[PDB]
Each structure stands twice: as C-alpha cells, then as structure tokens.
Design a protein around this ligand. Structure first.
Ligand code: HEM
Ligand SMILES: CCCCCCCC(=O)O
Length: 422
C-alpha cells in the first residue's frame, strides 16, 4: 500500500516528548534534522520504541555499541522477512539472501561471493579505471554541472554493467530497476508510488537476466573462455550451473547485487565531493598526501553512511540497555547514528581523512550480513579519487545540495560542481 509522503517542516526535536520522535520520517536527512534527532536519542533514549508511524511500531537503536550487539546476534534479531522498515509492494516481493537467516543465507552468499573477491576485482580494475577516465575526461571546466547524473550515476551504471557483463548500452536499466525497488514509498518512504511500472521492471528484469544467462551458456558451449563477470563465474561453479532452474534465487540475488551497489556507491561518490568542500583543509591535505586516498574512502563512507539503517525482527524477548524488545518487534539499527556516535569517533561530524579508526565505521554493518561488495565499493571510490587528483586542482561545490526523500537511502539528487584543471 503506497503513500505519497508530503513534506511538512520537521519540528525541532527539543519541542517533542521522546515517545513522539519518529525516525521513519523520510525528510529528516533532506531538512538536516537527522543529526539533532539521533543525538537526542543516543543521549536520552538509545533503545527507543515508536508505537505509531506510517510503517507501524518500531524500535530505534542509535548507539554504535548497541548496533554491533544487534547486527552480531542474527539468532536473536532475524533478517527475515525484510531488511527495510516497511514492506515491498503487494505481490512484488523478491527473495534476496540479505533478508535470509542461516543456513539458507550462507549457501546463497557462497554461490555469489567469488565475483567481488579481491582476486576477481584485480581482473576488473583496468576496465573500471578506463571507464572512469572516459567520464572524467568528458566533464566541462569552469562551468557548474550536476555531478549526480554526470559522474556518480554514470560511474555506478558502468560499475554494475562491468560486474554482470550486462549489455553496456542498456546499463541505465540496472540503475532504473534498483531505484524503483529500494525507493518504494511502502518500504523506505521513497518517492516511488507507481506499482504498474514495478510489475514492468519485474518482467523486464526476469527477461533480460534469463537472456544474459542463455547468451553466456551458448558462448560457453561454443568453447568461449569464462570471463570475470558474475554469470561466467556462476556457470563455471558446479553448484550454480543450473541456477536458472531456481528463478527466485537467480533473479532475487541478481536484483540484490544491483540494488546493493546502486545508491550506495553513487552517494559515496557524491558525498565525498561535498565532505571535502565542507572541510576544505582535508582536500589541501589529500593533494599533499595522495597516499591517504584508501583511508579517506573509509572516512567518506563513515561520514556519508549511504544506508541510514537496516531492519530486524526479534525472534524472542531481548533485554537491551534496560528495555525489553518483544518477540516480533521490528528493530532499526541506525548506522547513520552509530557513525556519528562520539562514544566511538571523537569529533564524529568532522571529515578527518587520516582518522586512524575510520575503517571501524558500520556503514557496511557487522556480522554474517556484512556488505558483500565492500571491496568493490572501496575500489570504485579509490579509482575515482586517483583519477580525479591526476586531472583536477579544485572541485568546488556551488549552491546547496538537493537531498533524496527516504528513511533508508542518504543520497543526493543534485550536487552542482565546478572543476579547475591542473
Ligand atoms: C558505499 C557502498 C556500500 C555500502 C555503504 C553498503 C552497505 C551495506 C550494508 C549496511 C549491508 C547490510 C549489513 C548488515 O545487515 O549487517 C550490505 C549488505 C550487502 N551489500 Fe552492500 N554496501 C555498499 C556497496 C555494495 C556493492 C557495490 C554491492 C554489490 C555489488 C553490495 C552488495 C551487498 C550485498 C549482496 C549485501 C548482502 C550481504 C549479506 O546479507 O550477506 N554492496 N551492504
Ligand atoms: C543492501 C541493499 C538491499 C536493499 C533492499 C531493498 C528492497 C526493498 O525495498 O524491498
């Protein structure tokens, strides 16, 4: 049941009773209230029950420490049946291993893990660097342009096409299908309300992925050598040779990977540019010390936290910081709060590119569901920033960033950038 969320000014959090703070509001990030809202919960109600929202009753866990406890304890806090606050559109549910408990989760993850293993990422690195070079060489100088479509959306589309060996000139479909899956109003308070186009996406996605399998199956029978892409790898491994005979698992986990990498990588790419503009000393420091890029990528991902939360269901009664979460209660782990928790990160709101524990961020989560594409994400941002510093002396954000409506995605729709050449 899809709802067109209407933007009302969000109240100053100090003018509310604790019981009334609703973190499911998808305009908290846009209106720059998320910070104050999460600070007050961290300090006064770090394990907080909201009895009423558009999405029903849910708990918010906002302290770094408590997020680790919940994320680690998969047996107490199930990932089934969903991993977002709300529900997917009626009859348009997709079986992803992210929304799965062991042993089933482990089997499906093992089947697909190899594609983003550092060994296989080495095979792709040259192509990802080349496709990055092309886009950056195409950008206008001394002219403000929208970074989101031009670089972030573009590089992300290419990344997903590279990974799947998807028809390169149909790569916009992977972004479009991903946006409408993860941005459904019913799931995340996103802007997407049209369920007809979502049924179209399901048909278009099941067709195109079944086609890509058959095309690769033919080239292999024709004796062509297996490539570095996911379908090649799945067709090589004997467990996943007949994966097209498990259509739920096949389309589900293919959809999971594209949803997985889409907004996440894009908003990391946009977020990084903004973070270095709001903290101009960090950019001066990055240019003098470009060996900081790897750690900066960790700090950008901590600072952005592209996915605000992940949801779980208590499998039994669980005591947590003096609160009793009841069997069946929905629990949000607010990673966006944990990565700003001064109990872990001194000066948690500042971008510090040489932050020595940057890598201890929880943007990828923690435990058996820790991000499968972490290495791919870090690679793409490292590559982006290596290629940027080669070409550009300054990256100047102009005007105000426009932010996406969601309680799940922390993203940008517009980020106006002026480039200066070296
Ligand atoms: C900045 C980029 C990214 C961030 C911030 C991110 C964040 C996350 C988070 C928070 C989880 C779940 C953690 C948990 O429940 O404990 C996750 C899982 C996952 N991510 Fe990512 N991710 C990113 C990039 C990617 C990319 C590029 C891919 C694939 C190409 C990907 C694929 C996945 C998959 C498959 C899972 C499910 C893991 C499992 O359930 O076993 N992610 N990611
Ligand atoms: C880690 C990426 C997985 C996000 C799943 C969102 C799909 C839905 O809204 O049902």
């Amino acid at each position: 049941p899809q709802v067109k969320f209407l933007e009302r000014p969000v109240p100053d959090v100090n003018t509310l009773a604790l019981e009334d703070i609703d973190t499911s509001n998808p305009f908290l990030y846009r209106q720059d209230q998320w910070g104050a809202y999460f600070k007050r919960l961290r300090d006064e109600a770090p394990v907080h029950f909201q009895k009423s929202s558009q999405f029903g009753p849910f708990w918010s866990v906002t302290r770094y420490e408590d997020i680790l406890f919940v994320d680690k304890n998969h047996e107490l806090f199930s990932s089934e049946p969903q991993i977002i606050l709300g529900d997917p559109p009626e009859g348009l549910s997709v079986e992803m291993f992210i929304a799965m408990d062991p042993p089933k989760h482990d089997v499906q993850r093992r089947a697909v893990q190899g594609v983003v293993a550092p060994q296989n990422l080495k095979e792709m690195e040259g192509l990802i660097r080349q496709r990055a070079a092309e886009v950056l060489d195409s950008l206008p100088l001394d002219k403000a342009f929208n970074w989101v479509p031009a670089v972030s959306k573009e590089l992300t589309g290419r990344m997903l096409a590279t990974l799947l060996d998807f028809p390169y000139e149909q790569r916009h479909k992977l972004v479009d299908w991903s946006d409408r899956l993860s941005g459904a109003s019913s799931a995340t308070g996103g802007e997407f309300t049209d369920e007809d186009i979502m049924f179209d996406d399901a048909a278009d996605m099941a067709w195109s992925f079944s086609r890509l399998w058959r095309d690769k199956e033919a080239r292999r029978k024709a004796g062509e050598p297996p490539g570095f892409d996911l379908i090649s790898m799945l067709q090589s491994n004997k467990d996943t040779r007949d994966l097209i005979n498990r259509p739920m698992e096949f389309i589900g986990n293919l959809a999971l990977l594209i949803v997985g990498g889409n907004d996440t990588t894009r908003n990391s790419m946009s977020g990084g540019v903004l973070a270095l503009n709001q903290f101009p000393e960090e950019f001066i420091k990055l240019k003098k010390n470009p060996e900081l890029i790897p750690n900066m990528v960790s700090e950008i991902i901590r600072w952005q936290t592209p996915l605000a939360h992940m949801r779980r269901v208590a499998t039994q009664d669980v005591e947590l910081r003096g609160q009793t979460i009841k069997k069946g209660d929905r629990v949000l782990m607010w990673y966006a709060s944990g990565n700003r928790d001064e109990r872990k990160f001194e000066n948690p709101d500042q971008l510090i590119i040489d932050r020595k524990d940057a890598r201890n961020h929880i943007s990828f989560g923690y435990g058996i569901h820790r991000c499968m594409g972490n290495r791919l994400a870090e690679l793409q941002l490292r590559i982006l920033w290596e290629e940027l510093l080669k070409r550009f002396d300054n990256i100047e954000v102009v005007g105000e960033p426009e932010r996406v409506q969601s309680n799940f995605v922390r993203g940008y729709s517009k980020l106006m950038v002026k480039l200066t050449a070296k």
